[PDB]
Amino acid sequence: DSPHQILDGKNCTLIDALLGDPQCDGFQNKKWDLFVERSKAYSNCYPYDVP
Amino acid sequence: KRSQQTVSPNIGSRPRVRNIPSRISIYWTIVKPGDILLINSTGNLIAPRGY
Amino acid sequence: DYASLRSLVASSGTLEFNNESFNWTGVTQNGTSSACIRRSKNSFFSRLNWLTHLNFKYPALNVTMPNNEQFDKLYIWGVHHPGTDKDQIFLYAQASGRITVSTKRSQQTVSPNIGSRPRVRNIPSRISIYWTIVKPGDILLINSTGNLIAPRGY
Numbered sequence A: 001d002s003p004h005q006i007l008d009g010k011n012c013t014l015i016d017a018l019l020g021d022p023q024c025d026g027f028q029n030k031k032w033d034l035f036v037e038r039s040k041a042y043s044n045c046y047p048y049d050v051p
Numbered sequence B: 001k002r003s004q005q006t007v008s009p010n011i012g013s014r015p016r017v018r019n020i021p022s023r024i025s026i027y028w029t030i031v032k033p034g035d036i037l038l039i040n041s042t043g044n045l046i047a048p049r050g051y
Numbered sequence C: 001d002y003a004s005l006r007s008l009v010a011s012s013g014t015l016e017f018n019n020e021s022f023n024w025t026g027v028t029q030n031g032t033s034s035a036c037i038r039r040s041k042n043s044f045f046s047r048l049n050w051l052t053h054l055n056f057k058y059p060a061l062n063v064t065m066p067n068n069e070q071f072d073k074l075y076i077w078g079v080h081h082p083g084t085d086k087d088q089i090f091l092y093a094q095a096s097g098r099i100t101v102s103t104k105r106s107q108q109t110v111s112p113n114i115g116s117r118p119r120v121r122n123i124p125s126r127i128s129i130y131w132t133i134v135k136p137g138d139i140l141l142i143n144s145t146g147n148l149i150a151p152r153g154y
């Protein structure tokens, strides 16, 4: 963890957390030096596609 | 003031994801220090809540 | 995006084409052209299907094809832009629609545009070809209201 701020996505992706998937609502209003995305990340909300 | 982004809704059936055939496309717009975001919509608008 | 399709097919290194049997009920299959002469007969692209009106009736096409095999599939589809409006009435029997191909992730929407263009091989009309890649779990769906150069297989 030290000395770089690490935020673990757990069951979340950065775009999903930005949009506000319910499961990701924990990461709201948080900052990071390095964001970590897990492979098991899944979305639980309206089908979203981002060009 | 700097740029315009126009997107036309496309209504059609699409493969079911999480038992939801409809979808949502997400786009981003950057607003400079002195600038105005003007949104013209007659329908099908998923709207921002803040910045 | 011609360069992307060219590089993709070249990197894959196979032109293997497995033919598939879609619904295609209510529309006339095959299709012919004067410029695409094959064995002294008017014809069209071997891996593409020119759908045309049937009994002056073009139903909305909602045709679904899944992948149950364990390999990624490449589908080649197209939109026919007619030179003239007379031709649109003759070939598709309705007004211009929207062609939308869709999978769980990717969705492409193309609108036919009818206008005259510099004639090539005495053909004013044009056809725009797009590619869609379907994953194993994913399925392919098309909403055609006309002007669709449909795939024959993958």
Ligand SMILES: *[C@@H]1O[C@H](CO)[C@@H](O[C@@H]2O[C@H](CO)[C@@H](O[C@@H]3O[C@H](CO[C@H]4O[C@H](CO[C@H]5O[C@H](CO)[C@@H](O)[C@H](O)[C@@H]5O)[C@@H](O)[C@H](O[C@H]5O[C@H](CO)[C@@H](O)[C@H](O)[C@@H]5O)[C@@H]4O)[C@@H](O)[C@H](O[C@H]4O[C@H](CO)[C@@H](O)[C@H](O)[C@@H]4O)[C@@H]3O)[C@H](O)[C@H]2NC(C)=O)[C@H](O)[C@H]1NC(C)=O
Pocket: C022, C023, C024, C025, C026
């Ligand atoms: C290839 O594509 C074809 C489609 O072209 C597809 O077959 C279709 O399958 C769906 C799903 O079952 C069928 O939809 C059902 O429709 C039932 C009502 O059918 C009536 O209307 C049909 C359309 O008529 C149009 O055109 C006439 C003029 O020709 C016009 O007057 C009408 O007003 C209308 O505009 C008509 O074809 C049909 O006649 C057939 O009826 C039966 C088959 O249903 C049989 O006797 C014959 O085959 C006859 O030709 C009839 O007049 C409706 O009852 C049904 O709704 C129930 O089921 C759904 C789904 O479970 C439930 O959600 C719902 O609540 C009801 O319980 C359903 O909506 C469609 O009619 C088929 N099309 C046909 C048969 O041509 C094939 O599967 C595809 N094949 C492959 C391999 O992919």
Ligand SMILES: *[C@@H]1O[C@H](CO)[C@@H](O[C@@H]2O[C@H](CO)[C@@H](O[C@@H]3O[C@H](CO[C@H]4O[C@H](CO)[C@@H](O)[C@H](O)[C@@H]4O)[C@@H](O)[C@H](O[C@H]4O[C@H](CO)[C@@H](O)[C@H](O)[C@@H]4O)[C@@H]3O)[C@H](O)[C@H]2NC(C)=O)[C@H](O)[C@H]1NC(C)=O
Pocket: B011, B012, B013, C060, C061, C062, C143, C144, C145
């Ligand atoms: C892909 O996207 C297209 C485009 O949205 C969809 O295709 C069709 O879209 C039209 C949009 O208007 C659908 O709606 C209308 O259907 C009406 C039903 O007519 C029925 O009439 C009697 C019942 O009294 C039935 O017995 C008969 O069999 C017909 O089914 C028509 O009235 C409509 O035509 C008129 O619409 C308005 C109404 O005032 C006027 O502007 C005109 O008079 C116009 O002529 C129109 O056809 C239509 O149902 C859609 N087709 C289908 C098969 O659903 C596709 O649905 C979509 N594909 C998907 C989602 O998979």
Ligand SMILES: *[C@@H]1O[C@H](CO)[C@@H](O[C@@H]2O[C@H](CO)[C@@H](O[C@@H]3O[C@H](CO[C@H]4O[C@H](CO)[C@@H](O)[C@H](O)[C@@H]4O)[C@@H](O)[C@H](O[C@H]4O[C@H](CO)[C@@H](O)[C@H](O)[C@@H]4O)[C@@H]3O)[C@H](O)[C@H]2NC(C)=O)[C@H](O)[C@H]1NC(C)=O
Pocket: B013, B016, B019, B021, C062, C063, C064, C141
């Ligand atoms: C364009 O074409 C597409 C074709 O996909 C149409 O959209 C869908 O069509 C399918 C085919 O009928 C509909 O499938 C529905 O599945 C639902 C159940 O979800 C799944 O649940 C479990 C868990 O994964 C699966 O194992 C299971 O197999 C299901 O796939 C149900 O709504 C229906 O399933 C059946 O449920 C009960 C129990 O068997 C039956 O009694 C019902 O009669 C029903 O048959 C259904 O089969 C799906 O609903 C369609 N999507 C919709 C309606 O949004 C488009 O409609 C078409 N566009 C048009 C026509 O405009």
Ligand SMILES: *[C@@H]1O[C@H](CO)[C@@H](O[C@@H]2O[C@H](CO)[C@@H](O[C@@H]3O[C@H](CO)[C@@H](O)[C@H](O[C@H]4O[C@H](CO)[C@@H](O)[C@H](O)[C@@H]4O)[C@@H]3O)[C@H](O)[C@H]2NC(C)=O)[C@H](O)[C@H]1NC(C)=O
Pocket: C019, C028, C029, C030
């Ligand atoms: C429009 O006309 C075409 C025919 O040009 C037709 O599409 C064909 O439909 C048939 C039947 O569904 C498909 O099956 C073929 O039938 C022919 C009959 O002559 C056979 O010779 C074929 O076998 C050869 O081709 C295979 C695929 O390359 C080879 O693996 C095999 O070894 C043989 O060489 C095959 O059984 C056929 O694939 C299509 N396509 C073509 C180009 O034939 C279509 O149905 C017609 N449309 C309408 C509306 O009538």
Ligand SMILES: *[C@@H]1O[C@H](CO)[C@@H](O)[C@H](O)[C@H]1NC(C)=O
Pocket: A011, A023
């Ligand atoms: C994340 O996924 C795991 C899968 O084993 C599950 O047990 C856990 O409850 C999930 N966490 C959240 C917050 O959904």
